[PDB]
Amino acid sequence: QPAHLCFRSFVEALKVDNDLVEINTPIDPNLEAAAITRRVCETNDKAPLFNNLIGMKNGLFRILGAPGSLRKSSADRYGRLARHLALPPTASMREILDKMLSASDMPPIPPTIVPTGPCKENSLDDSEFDLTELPVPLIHKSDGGKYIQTYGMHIVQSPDGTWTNWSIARAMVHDKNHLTGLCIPPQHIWQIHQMWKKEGRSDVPWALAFGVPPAAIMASSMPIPDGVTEAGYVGAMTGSSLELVKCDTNDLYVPATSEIVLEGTLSISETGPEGPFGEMHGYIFPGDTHLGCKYKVNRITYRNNAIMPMSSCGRLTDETHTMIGSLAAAEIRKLCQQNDLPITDAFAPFESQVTWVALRVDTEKLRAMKTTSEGFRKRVGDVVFNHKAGYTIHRLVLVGDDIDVYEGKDVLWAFSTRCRPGMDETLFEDVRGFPLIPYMGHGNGPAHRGGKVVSDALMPTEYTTGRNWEAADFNQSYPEDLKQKVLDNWTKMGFSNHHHH
Amino acid sequence: QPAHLCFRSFVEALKVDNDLVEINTPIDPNLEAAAITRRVCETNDKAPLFNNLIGMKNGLFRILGAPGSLRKSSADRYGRLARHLALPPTASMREILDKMLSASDMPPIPPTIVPTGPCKENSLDDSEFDLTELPVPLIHKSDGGKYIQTYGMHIVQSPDGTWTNWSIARAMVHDKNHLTGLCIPPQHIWQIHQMWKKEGRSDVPWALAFGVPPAAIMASSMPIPDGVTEAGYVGAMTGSSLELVKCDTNDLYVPATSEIVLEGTLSISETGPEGPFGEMHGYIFPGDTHLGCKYKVNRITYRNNAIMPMSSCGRLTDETHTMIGSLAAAEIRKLCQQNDLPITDAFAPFESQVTWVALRVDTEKLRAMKTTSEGFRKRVGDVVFNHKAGYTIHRLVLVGDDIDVYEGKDVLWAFSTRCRPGMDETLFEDVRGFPLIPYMGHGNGPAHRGGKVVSDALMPTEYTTGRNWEAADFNQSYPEDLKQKVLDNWTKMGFSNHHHH
Numbered sequence A, B: 001q002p003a004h005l006c007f008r009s010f011v012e013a014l015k016v017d018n019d020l021v022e023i024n025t026p027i028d029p030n031l032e033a034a035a036i037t038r039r040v041c042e043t044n045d046k047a048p049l050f051n052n053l054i055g056m057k058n059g060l061f062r063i064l065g066a067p068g069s070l071r072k073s074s075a076d077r078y079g080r081l082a083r084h085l086a087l088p089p090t091a092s093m094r095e096i097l098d099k100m101l102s103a104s105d106m107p108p109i110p111p112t113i114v115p116t117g118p119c120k121e122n123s124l125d126d127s128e129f130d131l132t133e134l135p136v137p138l139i140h141k142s143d144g145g146k147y148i149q150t151y152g153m154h155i156v157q158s159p160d161g162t163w164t165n166w167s168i169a170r171a172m173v174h175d176k177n178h179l180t181g182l183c184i185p186p187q188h189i190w191q192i193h194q195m196w197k198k199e200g201r202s203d204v205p206w207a208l209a210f211g212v213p214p215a216a217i218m219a220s221s222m223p224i225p226d227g228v229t230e231a232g233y234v235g236a237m238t239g240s241s242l243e244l245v246k247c248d249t250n251d252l253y254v255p256a257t258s259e260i261v262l263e264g265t266l267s268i269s270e271t272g273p274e275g276p277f278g279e280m281h282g283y284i285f286p287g288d289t290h291l292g293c294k295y296k297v298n299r300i301t302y303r304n305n306a307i308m309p310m311s312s313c314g315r316l317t318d319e320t321h322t323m324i325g326s327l328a329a330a331e332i333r334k335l336c337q338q339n340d341l342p343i344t345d346a347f348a349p350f351e352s353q354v355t356w357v358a359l360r361v362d363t364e365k366l367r368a369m370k371t372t373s374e375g376f377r378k379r380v381g382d383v384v385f386n387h388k389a390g391y392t393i394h395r396l397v398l399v400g401d402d403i404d405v406y407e408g409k410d411v412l413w414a415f416s417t418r419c420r421p422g423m424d425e426t427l428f429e430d431v432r433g434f435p436l437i438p439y440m441g442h443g444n445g446p447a448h449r450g451g452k453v454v455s456d457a458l459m460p461t462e463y464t465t466g467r468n469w470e471a472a473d474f475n476q477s478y479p480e481d482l483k484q485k486v487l488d489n490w491t492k493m494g495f496s497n498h499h500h501h
């Protein structure tokens, strides 16, 4: 099966790419696996596959860390993401995000039900598993639990059956047969959980599938629209109907090649202690436990030699940056275009801890709008910050056509030099805020509201008659023939120089 | 003579460091020398010494580009700056700025007058030079003149003789015997020029010395206090009285080993066209010429085989970033401490195009002040933005003790995650602004006023009871013994690793 459609195949692809380190000696799931993974992420090293995890019982489980993190080279920086999607490993961020948006103007391709698959190779009923006995990792030293769930997808369906959502939300072990996790607005797990709570008749049928098709985990991490079943979007994006099998204890459907599947219920009535957790913005607040949503596990099914993917998230760079940020930026780009805003490209700079999105503006189109900074800033922020796609993003930076928004240096340059603090910005205090950002949930103001800004790094003539500067750089401040002469004579003269490396 | 006290010796030091490329074939001062230099600066390459400059007449002149730019290695990144100051090439930014501040609590060491020096080896009177015939560089393709003056020091004295100022301000050739340049408030060349204008009796005696003692050009680039003679501050910093010779046509004194000296007057009545110029923030605005101060040149004296230093300034990284930013940050650090503010360190992040300064706070001292963010932000901004040392700086970022302000990544992390936009900031509209920043002089508001902000990236408990998080990083989220085990086993397990490279 192809790498994008089968996690086991994806692991093989990373090996074959020389982008894997198999660690066959014993590694402790208490901090050691996550520490190695953390180091990998901070240094853009090869992904670690822990084949010998202390306490692995009954085939449960190996760990793959850093599944969606960066490679060291610039040439294949995003290769691990490209391998989720059947793209060449040299794919640009623009190409990856276009691939992720491609299904937005295609008919869904609904999934195909098959009678069995590898995820049924082994099973454990309620009397045969204990989640506290599994080699669940402690990811950060002050975490409030063992976070089994950092890179699986929760599967829940609307009561009426019309919408089946796949998403990543964290979860930790509560006891032998329960998890706790985050289910917060405006996320689709929360929106569906609300529907069940209002019907008030039963707990929500649930499954959590780990080691799912890489193309499915990418969609799981993307804020595609309300009511849209991720399976059918992935089907359209890949051009292939995904093969699903039914759960044994409920009527939900899981990817046939899932490494590990939990089946059970998400309670409409019960909560339990959840967190703290080392989070995407790079912090943990010791002792900061709150009540989260509570899941009961009734059944585990799993592949022979099952592999649990894990995100050791925190400071740059991991899945929380490469996937949360970039895929929100992708959705935002589309949302802006669908609202008739002249946005060509969007990216969440890593340097902003993916709390910013830079929006590249088609300034020819802007000029034709005959508008002003104050008006345009307000329009853009109203579109984005009133929508779920804008949830995680606290600052939008508008930049003209000369800026490559996928290059953080250039975004920082434009922001720092073209946006006058205060005057060129509009603050938004009556929008939903992202509480996980420290300055929100642990800050001076409301955890859940405001703290958002549109920063306009368009220069004044970009609204009127056109750019009226040239950069003071090698590219723009010297004619072509001279630049080429300099480059041609560079090593001859005695200076230093390869793209791949 | 030592490298820090003699420019010729400094050039030798760079050679011997393997930090120089001597280019002995013909190079055009029309753009080619500056293009090579620009490429050097954008790639942190070796400094170029142009020994064969097309149009060099009567020993005038060779060019050294990138005299204060960065080296490629992290280990000696700042080595070219260290070589200005007699510091080891491995010196940290903290060590360089402490060296630059060391004279602030020392008695000046006044200069020593000597009867002659190398700068008297050759002379040209009014009938014998023509500044339009010299190989003055065109630094950027759209510059409004040939900028002879990018790395020399202007020398002017108060009418009463009590203060002799050395500073860098740009100047370009106007005609055979005049320059035009920038003389803008609150800079000391402007402040002294004002004194002469109010006395109204004569033009200002002036000299411009190129290829001065490297320690003197560093002080020339630093906003040491009003009324303080830079020569005596350099003397104290270096522990050595600087040797000066008298000009031939006026009673000012120039460094004995100056490569090239112009003697003349700065007019109290006349102006001429000046600019545009490719500037420190990375822009030029074609055709944007304004009236600037006008200098008359009466005499040139120069060393045999004179070398003109040149800054090909613009986008990162050159003298305008490494020297303007860092030395303003140094002065700001001291200014804050002298105002009883608990600031340990200051640096202007390159990523901000040196428009920000990050201020590291001693949070133990902050806690004892029993204050709030709104109060502390206002206090800091009033101190800094009402002072000349704060002129070029539009955003101050306050950070706690865990942040290394000399590391831009860490500043960006703190800013992005700990400062809530709007609520955690104070805007300052009634302070002097820096017009050269595009969003000021070419922006939506007053070119010369406002557009400044204090952004508080201290978290709330840093004011009260102490930091209440741990980072979600390898350093802080794993115990010491585990971290060391991981590092010790790193290459054994199969991952990738040298400090010098």
Ligand SMILES: Cc1cc2c3c(c1C)C(C)(C)CC=[N+]3c1c([nH]c(=O)[nH]c1=O)N2C[C@H](O)[C@H](O)[C@H](O)COP(=O)(O)O
Pocket (backbone or CB within 6 Å): A149, A150, A151, A165, A166, A167, A168, A169, A170, A171, A182, A184, A186, A187, A188, A189, A220, A221, A222, A223, A224, A311, A313, A319, A320, A323, A324
């Ligand atoms: C890649 C990724 C995405 C996480 C995530 C992580 C990763 C690795 C973790 C597990 C390591 C850390 C926490 N995560 C959470 C999360 N969203 C959320 O609501 N709660 C979370 O706990 N997200 C983001 C979430 O997946 C996106 O916002 C989706 O758009 C949600 O899908 P939906 O649009 O269908 O609701």
Ligand SMILES: Cc1cc2c3c(c1C)C(C)(C)CC=[N+]3c1c([nH]c(=O)[nH]c1=O)N2C[C@H](O)[C@H](O)[C@H](O)COP(=O)(O)O
Pocket (backbone or CB within 6 Å): B149, B150, B151, B165, B166, B167, B168, B169, B170, B171, B182, B184, B186, B187, B188, B189, B220, B221, B222, B223, B224, B311, B313, B319, B320, B323, B324
């Ligand atoms: C290192 C450096 C500093 C320049 C400078 C440049 C460099 C290379 C140039 C020449 C390449 C580009 C323009 N420069 C100007 C400048 N200050 C100013 O008022 N006008 C200028 O044109 N500065 C900054 C100035 O030197 C500092 O603000 C000093 O503090 C001024 O000294 P003062 O405190 O004695 O006035």
Ligand SMILES: [K+]
Pocket (backbone or CB within 6 Å): A166, A167, A168, A219, A220, A221, A222, A223, A224, A230
């Ligand atoms: K999703």
Ligand SMILES: [K+]
Pocket (backbone or CB within 6 Å): A418, A419, A420, A424, A456, A457, A458, A459, A460, B439
């Ligand atoms: K602007």
Ligand SMILES: [K+]
Pocket (backbone or CB within 6 Å): B166, B167, B168, B219, B220, B221, B222, B223, B224, B230
């Ligand atoms: K000075």
Ligand SMILES: [K+]
Pocket (backbone or CB within 6 Å): A439, B418, B419, B420, B424, B456, B457, B458, B459, B460
């Ligand atoms: K703050």
Ligand SMILES: [Mn+2]
Pocket (backbone or CB within 6 Å): A165, A166, A167, A188, A223, A224, A225, A228, A230
């Ligand atoms: Mn969804």
Ligand SMILES: [Mn+2]
Pocket (backbone or CB within 6 Å): B165, B166, B167, B188, B223, B224, B225, B228, B230
């Ligand atoms: Mn001065």
